[PDB]
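Sat 14:20. Reprocessing the chain from the morning session after the first attempt stalled halfway. Input below, unchanged.
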Amino acid sequence: HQDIRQRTAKSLADHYNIDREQARRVLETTEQLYTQWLAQNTKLVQPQLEALLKWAAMLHEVGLSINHSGMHRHSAYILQNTNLPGFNQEQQTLLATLVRMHRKAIKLDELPRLNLFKKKYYLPLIQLLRLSTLLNNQRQSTTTPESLRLITDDSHWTLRFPHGYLTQNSLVQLDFEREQAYWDDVVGWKLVIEEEEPD
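Finished this time. Tokens:
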């Protein structure tokens, strides 16, 4: 399934001309946050969902050629409806769900029925993907924080940037304030934005 999925993802990447540099920077951020997240929520460890999050990071832009406006929905549409060797139906559905929910306003009432995957296990993975795709939205122009610390108590999350980073990257700060507002509309989610001390 590992190599089958790699083939499938590569076929999608080639067909849709996905920007691979952008997929890779998103995955890298996603993996760095995932490591920090996992240690703090060990009861939620789910390696199959971790794998699907990885493919969501790789494939989240597949819908870009349909439109940049609503891209998350268009990428999810393609991922839900294309034949995806190596993804069974519920994995396919969950993959599409991660992508559908990775930006703009979230509705928990649009959550799919899945026997295999409970929302306590995948909701935080949506939160990871939302942050990682957001941090990278300036693409090649992204200035990657030298450090990013994620502190969680369930779905109340604190992201701590390097000292001076937010002031220096103002569009990042504005994007993150918008995300906090989005989380203020989602039950159980709260996002706090912090800065390291000068030390």
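The chain has one domain: 1-199.
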